[PDB]
Amino acid sequence: FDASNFKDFSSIASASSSWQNQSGSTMIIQVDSFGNVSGQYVNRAQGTGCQNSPYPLTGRVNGTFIAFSVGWNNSTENCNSATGWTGYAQVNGNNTEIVTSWNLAYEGGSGPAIEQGQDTFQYVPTTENKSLLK
Amino acid sequence: FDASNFKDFSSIASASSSWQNQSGSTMIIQVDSFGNVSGQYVNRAQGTGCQNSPYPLTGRVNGTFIAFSVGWNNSTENCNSATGWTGYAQVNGNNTEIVTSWNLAYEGGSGPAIEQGQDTFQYVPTTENKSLLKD
Known part of the structure; x- marks a missing residue:
């Protein structure tokens, strides 16, 4: 996968790819041919619960457009919330990024509320070792 | 719902349910025990592309909270865009509803853009027939 020449999600379909946003959160995703x-x-956004453990993420792609969803209970920590992100991939400065808007639905002070924000994810190329033993 | 603890496990561990929003769009969902x-x-929003054919949806639930996603290509019609909904289930007037905000990412005049909105889905009860041939 040439991250400097990403065309659409089929450039990255069929193998895993890793991503990191401006807040330190990371994701690893699989896009299939369907x-x-x-x-x-893995959430690391300052001020939030449910950090530093993996949460399942699902979604859908159409060409360069994507939407994906995370519920905030993985059996390690339950934050009783959900986030949906929606946006698109593009090549920016010889890497690829996914630009998104998100909504977080949660129990607020006076009842259920939806908080909005934006995340941008940068592609993270794999690092490689000879073997698992140092 | 505490009473759900005192029923068949298999029947309550998962959900199969239909929903209609205020625009007449429908979705059929399956929520598993995980x-x-x-x-x-099926989109029916007035004047939009990609109406009247089913598009895959995928999502996650946590408690009463839900987020789900649709890409707008099913090989019948491609609208080159994606929508993400986020919200929660609640009860009113003796029916369950899902109250959501959505984002739509699409190709606008100037390049990619995001549109925002709200949808509320009402639960739709199953119709039951004797057979495919007789009601």
């Missing part, structure tokens, strides 16, 4: 997205999301 | 949502969405 437009499905699976993956795992 | 939190995974699958289903099919």
